[PDB]
Amino acid sequence: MLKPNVAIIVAALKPALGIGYKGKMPWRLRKEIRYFKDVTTRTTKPNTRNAVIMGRKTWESIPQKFRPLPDRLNIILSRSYENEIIDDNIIHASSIESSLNLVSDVERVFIIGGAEIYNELINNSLVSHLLITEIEHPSPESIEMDTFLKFPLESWTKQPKSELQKFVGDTVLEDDIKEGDFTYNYTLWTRK
Ligand SMILES: NC(=O)C1=CN([C@@H]2O[C@H](COP(=O)(O)OP(=O)(O)OC[C@H]3O[C@@H](n4cnc5c(N)ncnc54)[C@H](OP(=O)(O)O)[C@@H]3O)[C@@H](O)[C@H]2O)C=CC1
Numbered sequence: 673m674l675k676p677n678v679a680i681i682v683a684a685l686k687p688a689l690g691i692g693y694k695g696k697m698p699w700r701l702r703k704e705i706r707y708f709k710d711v712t713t714r715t716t717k718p719n720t721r722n723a724v725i726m727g728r729k730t731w732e733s734i735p736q737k738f739r740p741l742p743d744r745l746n747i748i749l750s751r752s753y754e755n756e757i758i759d760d761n762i763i764h765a766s767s768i769e770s771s772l773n774l775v776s777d778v779e780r781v782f783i784i785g786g787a788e789i790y791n792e793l794i795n796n797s798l799v800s801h802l803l804i805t806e807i808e809h810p811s812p813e814s815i816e817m818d819t820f821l822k823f824p825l826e827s828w829t830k831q832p833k834s835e836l837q838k839f840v841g842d843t844v845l846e847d848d849i850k851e852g853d854f855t856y857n858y859t860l861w862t863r864k
């Protein structure tokens with residue numbers, strides 16, 4: 673696959689854009705996990721699938737019994753890996769672009785984390801869209817976080833919900849979803 677458009681998908685707590693703590697997500701938002709699953713799995717073309725790219729630490733954080741993520745091509749990046757097709761669902765690679773050379777019959781490509789991957793790949797011009805779940809809490813400072821997004825948002829434009837809807841197709845997008853003390857909304861951003 674040559675120069676595909678790539679999307680980053682992440683959930684962050686405003687205003688600092690915290691995304692983790694000691695290797696885990698600092699929240700368990702049931703509806704959000706379901707949205708992640710649907711957006712990253714659904715395709716429109718016929719015999720295609722989407723590809724999810726992640727850092728080695730992220731891969732290792734998924735219980736072995738629950739990986740690879742089903743119904744998607746999984747690509748794991750490590751600076752120590754040789755470009756290798758493990759099986760039909762798993763690819764090992766040392767760079768995003770090399771990994772993409774190994775794929776065919778992929779519709780969309782998503783970067784799913786973690787922090788290091790995100791903070792590095794945001795500056796790669798292959799990244800054309802950001803799907804950011806913006807999470808709000810009454811006392812954000814009470815949530816322990818050690819990992820944050822460092823995205824140059826001044827170079828990106830948040831699109832209206834209509835554009836997000838068009839992006840996701842059929843997926844139901846509820847507004848101001850509440851789960852415990854968290855309130856969240858899905859958003860789409862494109863480069864200026
Ligand atoms: N809020 C959210 O939506 C999400 C949050 N996260 C959070 O992220 C955190 C984990 O992030 P982090 O620890 O940084 O882990 P990552 O998943 O980003 O893995 C980092 C590893 O990826 C490899 N890697 C990193 N950059 C590159 C590169 N540019 N090219 C090739 N390989 C590269 C390296 O592997 P090697 O060392 O083998 O070279 C590095 O050690 C947790 O807190 C987790 O909860 C994760 C996903 C979503």
Ligand SMILES: Nc1nc(N)c2c(Cl)c(N)ccc2n1
Nearest residue numbers: 681682683705708784785805
């Ligand atoms: N928005 C969004 N983005 C991710 N990358 C997510 C991941 Cl990897 C897990 N595991 C769960 C929810 C997510 N939610």
